[PDB]
Structure 1
Amino acid sequence: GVLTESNKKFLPFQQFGRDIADTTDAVRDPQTLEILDITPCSFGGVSVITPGTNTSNQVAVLYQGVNCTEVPVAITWRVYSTGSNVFQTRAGCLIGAEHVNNSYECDIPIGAGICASYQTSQSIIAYTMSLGAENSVAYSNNSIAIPTNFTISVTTEILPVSMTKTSVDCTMYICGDSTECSNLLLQYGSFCTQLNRALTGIAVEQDKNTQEVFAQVKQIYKTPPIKDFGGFNFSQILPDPSKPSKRSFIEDLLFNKVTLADAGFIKQ
């Protein structure tokens, strides 16, 4: 830590001052009876603000909870600390991003109302994001606005219903194929039974979730062979009988869009 002059008061021959976390906060010099307060030297997290790698390799770094005055103190890498790019934010001091006065809709959230984005040659800007367009509704005590037309707007809403059923064997996961370890683990009472009960409850609850969401009709209605629905066209959402799966065009699109390139089903 760092040592500094202290405005504290001590006993005639007191020694030091501890704090809440059982860490010494101040100390009296043994040689000369002078008191120093111990403040740990600067530390904090590091966040790297970047666009996509294909977009650019330029990055900006945010030293969280830190004014950049201790960046010259430790002046591992030090490439971007040349200066003229230092910006002070309430989320820490930002290095490598230009500050601009105007406002835009947020692209990369930094904190305390500051966002970063890649704009025009090309550089990373840091701005106080705008909450939205201004608007003064023409209110009057005798004026009204009435729609003379309309639009029919369809919007999507994706909701997760269930998740993957996983059941584990506690003993096998811990030390499968080990009699000595099986006997030793048996001394821990019923922990594996508790874990298996919890995971089985989750697995059954997944089926309950799916049933509650979907099985709300006891009769499987089907549309008539004549699609005379007043001109409305439901082909994209009605099932397509040609495919082996009796699901619609949009359903195929969704099932193809959801990718499991991670270890989800690759470990099948």
Structure 2
Amino acid sequence: HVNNSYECDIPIGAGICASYQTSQSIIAYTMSLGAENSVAYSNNSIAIPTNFTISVTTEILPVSMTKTSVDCTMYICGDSTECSNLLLQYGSFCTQLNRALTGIAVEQDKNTQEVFAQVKQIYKTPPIKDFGGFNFSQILPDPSKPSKRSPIEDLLFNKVTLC
């Protein structure tokens, strides 16, 4: 136990965390919400900016998932005919399960067609690049590569690894 306050990396409970620092050991403490700060206030005082900055931020959202399909009789009964006869005593378990899994597979193609198909026509960029000093080389497609992908897209494609 120590007196200092730090951030959160490994939660424990009731405001305690654990971290590895440097000799080298394991520490326990209480988390800190943030740096303390105060603002000067008055009834005839104001502040106005004078310079600006431009930033870029990214967000990642899932869209769809891989489809699956399972045969009812094959999995639970094998190829023996003696097994299959006793299964028919239960009424419609095999048909009930198949309908549920087929509805999911159809729905997945609807999700991807609703987030990307929002333009009627297909537009093409002009051959000559001149935008008054603006450079878009990291987003536009690269004709050199075998497939029409941007440099940013290629870096993302190999980052996620998928029997």
Per the normalisation by structure 2, the TM-score is 0.91
Once the two structures are TM-superposed, the CA of residue 143 in structure 1 deviates from its matched residue by 2.2
Distance 2:43 2:78 in 1: 79
Once the two structures are TM-superposed, the CA of residue 259 in structure 1 deviates from its matched residue by 0.9
Once the two structures are TM-superposed, the CA of residue 140 in structure 1 deviates from its matched residue by 2.7
Q: Secondary structure at the match of 1:203?
A: helix
Specify whether residues 167 and 230 from structure 1 end up closer, same or farther in structure 2 by C-alpha distance, changes over 3 A only. farther
C-alpha RMSD of the superposition: 1.5
Asked if 1:120 is matched to 2:37, the reply is no
Structure 2, unmatched stretches of 5+, are none
Once the two structures are TM-superposed, the CA of residue 196 in structure 1 deviates from its matched residue by 1.7
Deviation string 1:151-171 (CA, Å, 9 cap, x unpaired) is 211111010000111111122
Q: Secondary structure at the match of 2:47?
A: strand
Specify whether residues 143 and 170 from structure 1 end up closer, same or farther in structure 2 by C-alpha distance, changes over 3 A only. farther
Specify whether residues 118 and 187 from structure 1 end up closer, same or farther in structure 2 by C-alpha distance, changes over 3 A only. same
Specify whether residues 141 and 178 from structure 1 end up closer, same or farther in structure 2 by C-alpha distance, changes over 3 A only. farther
Q: Which region of structure 1 is more displaced relative to structure 2, 139-148 or 197-206?
A: 139-148
Q: What corresponds to 2:141 in structure 1? A: 239
Which protein is richer in strand relative to its size?
1
Q: Which is bigger in relative contact order (C-alpha 8 A, separation at least 6)?
A: 2
Specify whether residues 184 and 124 from structure 1 end up closer, same or farther in structure 2 by C-alpha distance, changes over 3 A only. same
Specify whether residues 101 and 219 from structure 1 end up closer, same or farther in structure 2 by C-alpha distance, changes over 3 A only. same
Which protein is richer in helix relative to its size?
2
Distance 1:212 1:169 in 2: 30
Distance 1:170 1:143 in 2: 75
Distance 2:72 2:131 in 1: 56
Specify whether residues 224 and 127 from structure 1 end up closer, same or farther in structure 2 by C-alpha distance, changes over 3 A only. same
Distance 1:243 1:186 in 2: 57
Once the two structures are TM-superposed, the CA of residue 219 in structure 1 deviates from its matched residue by 1.3
Once the two structures are TM-superposed, the CA of residue 232 in structure 1 deviates from its matched residue by 1.8
Specify whether residues 101 and 216 from structure 1 end up closer, same or farther in structure 2 by C-alpha distance, changes over 3 A only. same
Per the normalisation by structure 1, the TM-score is 0.57
Q: Secondary structure at the match of 1:166?
A: coil
Deviation string 1:122-155 (CA, Å, 9 cap, x unpaired) is 0111111111121212233222222212221111
Distance 1:152 1:180 in 2: 73
Give the % identical residues. 99
Specify whether residues 171 and 120 from structure 1 end up closer, same or farther in structure 2 by C-alpha distance, changes over 3 A only. same
Distance 1:166 1:195 in 2: 13
Tell me which stretches of 4 or more aligned residues in structure 1 moved more than 4 Å.
none
